[PDB]
Amino acid sequence: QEEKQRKAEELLQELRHLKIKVEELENERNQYEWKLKATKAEVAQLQEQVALKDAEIERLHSQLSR
Amino acid sequence: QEEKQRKAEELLQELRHLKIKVEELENERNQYEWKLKATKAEVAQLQEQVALKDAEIERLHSQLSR
Ligand SMILES: [N+]
Ligand SMILES: [N+]
């Protein structure tokens, strides 16, 4: 039952490694959440550019039709 | 040293739980990677709409200036 002890120490090692993995995987999640946010800000700016250009096309069409 | 045994079983329980957490955190990562992809496809379609509207404004400006 040094091998009870040995299996114990094997399991601790494994716990340590899994705990580092969980810690890292929760870092990757946090930064995916902020890049998604950033990409969504890019969508919103583009929607804003489309609507400005639609306004400019409408203005030109009023003139064009006089 | 039933308590060697008892601490062993405590550690297995913990390993099981951490292994489920890692499994789930790697599910959340996979689906963040695909939502980011999807959001990026939305950006690309919008860039395409902007450029179509810029082409239409240019066409109108040529006419307007005749
Ligand atoms: N728009
Ligand atoms: N453009």
From Swiss-Prot, chains A, B:
Source organism of this protein record: Homo sapiens (Human)
Task of the protein: May regulate the disassembly of focal adhesions. Did not bind receptor-like tyrosine phosphatases type 2A.
Gene this protein is translated from: PPFIBP2
Similarity comment text for this entry: Belongs to the liprin family. Liprin-beta subfamily.
Tissue expression as described in the entry: Widely expressed.
Domain remark text: The N-terminal coiled coil regions mediate homodimerization preferentially and heterodimerization type beta/beta. The C-terminal, non-coiled coil regions mediate heterodimerization type beta/alpha.
Full-protein interval shown: 198 to 263 of 876
Protein name (record): Liprin-beta-2
Subunit structure: Forms homodimers and heterodimers.
